[PDB]
Amino acid sequence: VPAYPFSLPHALDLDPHYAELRRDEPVSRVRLPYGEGTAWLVTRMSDARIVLGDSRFSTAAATDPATPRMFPTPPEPDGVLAQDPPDHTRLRRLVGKAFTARRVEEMRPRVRSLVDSLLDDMVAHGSPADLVEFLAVPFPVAVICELLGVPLEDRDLFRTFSDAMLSSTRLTAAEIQRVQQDFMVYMDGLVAQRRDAPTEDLLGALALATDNDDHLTKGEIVNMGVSLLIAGHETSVNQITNLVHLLLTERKRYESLVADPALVPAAVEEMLRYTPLVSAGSFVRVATEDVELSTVTVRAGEPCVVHFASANRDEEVFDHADELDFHRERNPHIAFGHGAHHCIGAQLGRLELQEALSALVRRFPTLDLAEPVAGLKWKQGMLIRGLERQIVSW
Ligand code: HEM
Numbered sequence: 079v080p081a082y083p084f085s086l087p088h089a090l091d092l093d094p095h096y097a098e099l100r101r102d103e104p105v106s107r108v109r110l111p112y113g114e115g116t117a118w119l120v121t122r123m124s125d126a127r128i129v130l131g132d133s134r135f136s137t138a139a140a141t142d143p144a145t146p147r148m149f150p151t152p153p154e155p156d157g158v159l160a161q162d163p164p165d166h167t168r169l170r171r172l173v174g175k176a177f178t179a180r181r182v183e184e185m186r187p188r189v190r191s192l193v194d195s196l197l198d199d200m201v202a203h204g205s206p207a208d209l210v211e212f213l214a215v216p217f218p219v220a221v222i223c224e225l226l227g228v229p230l231e232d233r234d235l236f237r238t239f240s241d242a243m244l245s246s247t248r249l250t251a252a253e254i255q256r257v258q259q260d261f262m263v264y265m266d267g268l269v270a271q272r273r274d275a276p277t278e279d280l281l282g283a284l285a286l287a288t289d290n291d292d293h294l295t296k297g298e299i300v301n302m303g304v305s306l307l308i309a310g311h312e313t314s315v316n317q318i319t320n321l322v323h324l325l326l327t328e329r330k331r332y333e334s335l336v337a338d339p340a341l342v343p344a345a346v347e348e349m350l351r352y353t354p355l356v357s358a359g360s361f362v363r364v365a366t367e368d369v370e371l372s373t374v375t376v377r378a379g380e381p382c383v384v385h386f387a388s389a390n391r392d393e394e395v396f397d398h399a400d401e402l403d404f405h406r407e408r409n410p411h412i413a414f415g416h417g418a419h420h421c422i423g424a425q426l427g428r429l430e431l432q433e434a435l436s437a438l439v440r441r442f443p444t445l446d447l448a449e450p451v452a453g454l455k456w457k458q459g460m461l462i463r464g465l466e467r468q469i470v471s472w
């Protein structure tokens with residue numbers, strides 16, 4: 079019956095029907111914009127974890143044009159998220175051997191160098207300043223560049239490919255393609271150079287990854303680096319604005335970090351739990367067998383959407399579920415998903431948000447929102463919520 083996106087997003091606010099569903103119909107039929115039939119909407123954490131972390135669901139099945147979806151275009155099946163276990167598993171493994179926790183934590187001194195530079199320019203420009211232009215946009219692209227080992231001299235041209243994607247950019251017809259193909263050249267050229275001569279960075283290590291005699295192709299290393307640049311940029315950008323937004327606008331939260339900057343990591347986790355960043359939820363899962371859920375049981379062709387943000391507000395698992403508690407002891411959120419398709423960039427994402435917040439706290443203990451909240455330029459966040467602008471004073 080009900081059309082799925084129940085509403086267009088206001089701010090970081092949740093449509094009130096997810097909570098109602100969470101108590102009354104945790105698993106609920108809905109009709110998504112496109113594709114055919116209906117889908118199971120999964121609102122709570124228990125069911126979410128089953129659906130997201132059970133071998134009995136497929137994401138490759140949902141590349142079928144007659145599967146319910148959000149965009150008119152269906153999904154290409156060679157995309158990571160759409161890939162199913164045997165191959166996906168091979169994939170996660172190989173990049174796994176390069177996108178390691180160690181490499182990501184070893185970014186930290188460098189990444190902290192970049193944030194402090196960016197904030198230096200913000201101080202140079204004076205006392206009100208658009209946090210989006212000075213911090214949120216450049217910071218994620220610069221971090222990815224550094225991780226890929228994009229050579230220092232032509233990152234500015236990485237900056238234009240990246241933010242020539244974002245929710246809107248040049249709008250110059252579809253010759254955003256003449257942006258794709260000459261950049262696609264670049265990556266291929268770069269991937270080739272490091273395959274011959276590897277370096278301390280993702281590409282160099284994607285070049286060397288192995289798994290009992292198994293390889294990544296020049297082609298596979300291109301599709302990942304790009305897939306990673308796309309994914310990481312617009313999300314990280316928006317999330318930066320979302321956290322700042324939550325911290326100011328209640329502004330005792332920000333104070334609580336100034337007073338105690340050691341709380342930044344716990345705060346970020348808690349803020350990841352709370353922010354409904356992903357507005358329509360996760361990539362579509364299509365049950366391959368019969369999986370029993372909380373209240374219904376799902377049969378073999380029916381698709382489900384897991385809504386992460388509602389799972390993250392499930393009052394069965396989080397006390398004071400709809401409040402920000404930076405001192406919460408237990409926080410089993412799935413802001414980064416779960417199971418096989420758990421976010422590949424989860425740690426780099428935590429790195430970004432830790433260093434950003436901690437920098438703003440050291441350097442700008444007087445930070446404050448410098449426009450009225452009611453008027454804030456929220457993106458039309460069908461996919462990803464975030465702010466188009468964020469003026470702040472100090
Ligand atoms: C605020 C930061 C981030 C959040 C909240 C986030 C959230 C998520 C979520 C929820 C998924 C799973 C989708 C599903 O199961 O249907 C996911 C997957 C993914 N994320 Fe992120 N993500 C973030 C940052 C990043 C970054 C920085 C990158 C890359 C540098 C990235 C790349 C990916 C990729 C490649 C996948 C697919 C993994 C797979 O299918 O095996 N994400 N992310």
Ligand SMILES: Clc1ccccc1C(c1ccccc1)(c1ccccc1)n1ccnc1
Pocket residue numbers: 157158159308309310312313356359360361421461462
């Ligand atoms: Cl953020 C999100 C939620 C659900 C599905 C996909 C994505 C998103 C992504 C990642 C890899 C492949 C396709 C989409 C995504 C990419 C681009 C625009 C919106 C969402 N993602 C970004 C970071 N982590 C997950």
